[PDB]
Design a protein that fits this description.
The structure is cut from a larger assembly and holds chains A (112 residues), B (120 residues), C (50 residues), D (215 residues) and E (121 residues).
Chain A lengths: L1 H4 L18 E7 L8 E12 L6 E8 L2 E8 L5 E8 L25
Antiparallel strand pairs in A: 1-2, 1-5, 2-3, 3-4
Chain D lengths: L2 E13 L5 E8 L3 E7 L8 E5 L18 H8 L9 E4 L12 E2 L10 E6 L4 E3 L1 H4 L37 E3 L3 E7 L1 E5 L4 E5 L9 E6 L3
Chain E lengths: L6 E4 L5 E9 L13 E9 L10 E8 L4 E2 L5 E4 L3 E4 L18 H5 L2 H6 L4
Parallel strand pairs in E: 1-7
Antiparallel strand pairs in E: 1-2, 2-3, 3-4, 4-7, 5-6
The chains are: A mainly beta (112), B alpha+beta (120), C alpha+beta (50), D mainly beta (215), E mainly beta (121).
Chain D binds one RNA strand of 402 nucleotides through strand 1, strand 2, strand 3, helix 1 and strand 5.
Chain lengths: 112, 120, 50, 215, 121
RNA sequence: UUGGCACCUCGAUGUCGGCUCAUCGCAUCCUGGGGCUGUAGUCGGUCCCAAGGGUUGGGCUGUUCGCCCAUUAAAGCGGUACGCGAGCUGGGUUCAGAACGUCGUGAGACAGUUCGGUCCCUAUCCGUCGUGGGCGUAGGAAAUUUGAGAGGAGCUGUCCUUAGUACGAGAGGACCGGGAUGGACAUACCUCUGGUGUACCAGUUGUCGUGCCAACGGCAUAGCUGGGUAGCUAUGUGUGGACGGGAUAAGUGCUGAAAGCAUCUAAGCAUGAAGCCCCCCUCAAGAUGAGAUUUCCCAACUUCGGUUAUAAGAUCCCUCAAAGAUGAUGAGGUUAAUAGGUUCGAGGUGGAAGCAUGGUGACAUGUGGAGCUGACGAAUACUAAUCGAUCGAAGACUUAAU
């Protein structure tokens, strides 16, 4: 629609790189818990990417102490300081939903 | 977006049969509910026949049917050969609207209103 | 389930009030001269001239 | 106290100062003009009349509501305005600060940020009792024959009848609803829009009215 | 965990290894519970030398769930299993260690000690 | 409640316990307002006024009961053919089989147990929940409205401060006041997190076809498997029960006599409840008591004290939806963007065909942010809404004052 794109254009960001599913990112997230500002990282694999405008979202999965953890963040959130892409992976589909049931040698993905 | 009182497996075959019968005869009689949906199905087969590329010739073969037309007698051109041929060379300058519907009134014994669909 | 009382003639004729038939939409054809249903094709001649 | 009419557009989201995610509703109010003013000595009460959208002019052969008819033109020419699709009264706004022919702009809503929206709901048609009144179903197994059917409607001849107000199947939706104590996010005068926090009733192209919070 | 008969895993360091929920505290008629709420459970499995024997009735707190948690920033965190810890009646743990990550909603709950012994928050 | 009586029903008024949906009484379980204490405080006892709203989830028995586990501000008691079988369950109790204990010479019986064992009906009338057509409202029409009168909603916990203050020898620990967040229950909505998505994309097994290769089609639950737009959706996202006004109940009263003192009362003034009437939300002039406002139309006649056809408007028919069982409602009908095509987009799928190159081959890379695409947003009369028809006003009589 043309009236919803002119009222939400003032919230899009350009400091964002390009990343496909399967790629490993390093999301820097601002955390104000405690007394004031502080930054904590999160390194995982991209398994989902929903479409839209200022409503686009992405999901990153990591395994911690033997328990997998998934984080979903709105792409245009102001609570992200940086997004670094390290490893690019070859995949055959957009949604890597089969990664949850796997673990170990089976879970790792090949590099282009 | 119509079902025509049929299952998904029969609503597809009957549409493939109605689209091929028209390209051969160029004028057929049916009911109003079948004419408004076959309308959009036949208007897209002519769009493929106006591009000419081989990729388009293979996508039209998925909906078309194997039928011979002896009237022409020039090797009994198949229904798919008539398209990309006689039919593709008539609507070159026309962009959309290749069919026309005409009403005839209810039919005895069933009450359904007969219609005439033809290629412009 | 079953009717307790039979229906009288007075009651039966009031329910059938709206049980009527419709008059079709017909006009004289420009060329045929006979009557024709609007938006249809003249059976007598075959012309529509849309 | 203020009021204005508009049309729904859709749902979206915006980011706050601290990163808070806030869903919003897009509404458009472009052409609002005052047509009449009622008073105590005439018409009994105080209120004003407002049109929201512009219809076409009068033609000798009009067969749709798009063109205005003669009765609707004279009532509009009296205020020097063109035919309007929607007209509604506002008995809460003041009557001494408005003159006939005035234009109602969106920028009139500022520093209020608290309003109530009134509109018609979508509409579902003929529905059952489990979905219209949110009742419970019967057991789906164990040799049962009671699933989506309604329960007992009476009490065995103590009263040989059904009381007024029993919940039965029927047509639901299409009623006037009002959501109270909503907030205005921002107003873009460049496009004649109003970002409302939350959601409003009706389809995405229905008529909505906005007035100052009554509470 | 969430409902009356849900089975959770014990993440803390004690004898208890598996607990079955018995009740969700807070209000009359509460249905489910999520991270940061106390529940009443019963022990089903345990270690031969633990401190919590098999068949007891204690209180615990939810630290990991599969449903996840939504934040005011529009972001979601989900886990792969459900776990809790047997806590004393003063919000203190009954063990000396804590296994696995934990949610940061525990800090709001005022369970300060549990956050300290967690490997990842 | 267990009985007494035998007045209605034996050409027939179907049981116990549930389930689903409720209603109503107050002899009040919780919440609100008050006396008196053998009432220090925190907590209680008992009694009065109050029916607005609330008043859990499981284990064991066919059950009611009853006991137990864990909670809650509280887990109140009664009526309606012990509410309810043309609404539904059949576990117990009254069918035909068989067995045990007991009784009988016997056929068989329980003052007792055990396993098994068909619940049927297309709604005529009243009643109830939705939705249309007529006529009326003293000319015929199009919009916006007043509200007589009805309906809906009414609940409550834990923390923080006042204040570790009042009280008490200490342990303990507040009272109308100010803030912050929950439970349950209503309601609107699909941006977000999920489900569905049989005319969307991709992978794959067997077999039969398009003559063969390649590429495709039919049938095997939609053959199966991995994703998914619109729409509809809760477990998801917002909001709500918020402040005040006017008269009262039980209470405390202020003046004041009958009765030189006393006394809330017999005249005269106050104060005082989640309850009463308003405030909040929805429907409402068939409210025959049929209301009000703005605007539109108002001529030709044998001079029936009437009539015709039109006028402003509304339909027939046709293209559609945000509406919908049908109808009604809403958008439009070429003096036109209503729908379908066509040309660009968003979203989904994730790398088409052909050809070239590298391998004995199964396959891989390149051409290439490929190809395809139902419902969503724009532009465009190419196709179909043709030509036409029908309905629809000339405004009664009385006073009173002009």
């Amino acid at each position: 629609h043309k009236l919803i794109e002119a009222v939400t254009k003032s919230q899009l960001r350009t400091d964002l790189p390009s990343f496909r599913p399967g790629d490993t990112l390093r999301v820097h997230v601002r955390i104000i818990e405690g007394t004031r500002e502080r930054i904590q990282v999160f390194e995982g694999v991209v398994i989902k990417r929903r479409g839209g405008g200022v409503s686009e979202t992405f999901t990153v999965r990591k395994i911690s102490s033997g328990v997998g953890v998934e984080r979903t963040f709105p792409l245009h959130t102001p609570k992200i300081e940086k997004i670094e892409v390290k490893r690019r992976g070859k995949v055959r589909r957009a949604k890597l939903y089969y990664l949850r049931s796997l673990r170990g040698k089976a879970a790792r993905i090949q590099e282009i | 977006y119509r079902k025509l009182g049929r299952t998904s497996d029969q609503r597809k075959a009957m549409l493939r049969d109605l689209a091929t019968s028209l390209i051969i005869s160029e004028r057929i009689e049916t009911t109003e509910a079948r004419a408004k949906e076959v309308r959009s199905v036949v208007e897209k087969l002519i769009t493929l026949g106006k591009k000419g590329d081989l990729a388009s010739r293979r996508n039209a073969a998925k909906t078309l049917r194997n039928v011979e037309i002896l009237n022409e007698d020039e090797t009994t051109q198949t229904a798919l050969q008539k398209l990309f041929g006689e039919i593709a060379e008539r609507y070159t300058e026309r962009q959309g609207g290749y069919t026309r519907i005409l009403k005839q009134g209810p039919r005895r014994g069933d009450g359904a209103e007969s219609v005439i669909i033809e290629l412009v | 389930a079953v009717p307790k009382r039979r229906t009288s003639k007075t009651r039966k004729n009031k329910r059938r009030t709206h049980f009527k038939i419709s008059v079709p939409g017909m006009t004289e054809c420009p060329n045929c001269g006979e009557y024709k249903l609007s938006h249809r094709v003249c059976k007598n001649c075959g012309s529509y001239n849309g | 106290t203020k009021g204005i009419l508009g049309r729904k557009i859709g749902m979206t989201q915006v980011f706050g100062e601290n990163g808070e995610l806030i869903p919003v509703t897009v509404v458009e109010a472009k052409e609002n003009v005052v047509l009449q003013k009622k008073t105590v000595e005439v018409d009994g009460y105080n209120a004003i009349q407002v049109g929201f959208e512009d219809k076409k002019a009068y033609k000798k052969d009009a067969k749709s509501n798009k063109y205005a008819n003669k009765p609707a033109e004279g009532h509009a020419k009296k205020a020097d305005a063109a035919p309007k699709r929607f007209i509604r009264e506002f008995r809460n706004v003041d009557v001494d600060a408005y003159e006939v022919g005035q234009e109602v702009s969106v920028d009139t809503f500022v520093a209020g940020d608290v309003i109530d929206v009134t509109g018609v709901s979508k509409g579902k048609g003929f529905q059952g009792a489990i979905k219209r009144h949110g009742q419970s179903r019967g057991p789906m197994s164990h040799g049962s024959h009671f699933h989506r059917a309604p329960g007992s409607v009476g009490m065995a001849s103590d009263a040989s009848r059904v009381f007024k107000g029993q919940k039965m199947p029927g047509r639901m939706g299409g009623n006037t609803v009002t959501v109270q104590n909503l907030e205005v996010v921002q107003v873009d005068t460049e496009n004649k829009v109003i970002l409302v926090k939350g959601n409003v009733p009706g389809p995405k192209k229905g008529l909505v009215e906005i007035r100052t919070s009554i509470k | 965990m969430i409902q009356q008969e849900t089975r959770l895993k014990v993440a803390d360091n004690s004898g208890a290894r598996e607990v079955l929920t018995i009740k969700v505290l807070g209000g009359s008629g509460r249905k489910t519970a999520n991270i940061g709420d106390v529940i009443v459970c019963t022990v089903k499995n345990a270690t031969p030398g633990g401190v919590v024997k098999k068949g007891d009735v204690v209180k615990a707190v939810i630290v990991r769930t599969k449903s996840g948690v939504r934040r005011n920033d529009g972001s979601y965190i989900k886990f792969d299993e459900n776990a809790c810890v047997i806590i004393r009646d003063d919000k203190g743990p009954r063990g000396t260690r804590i296994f696995g990550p934990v949610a940061r909603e525990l800090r709001e709950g005022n369970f300060m000690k549990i956050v300290s012994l967690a490997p990842e928050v």
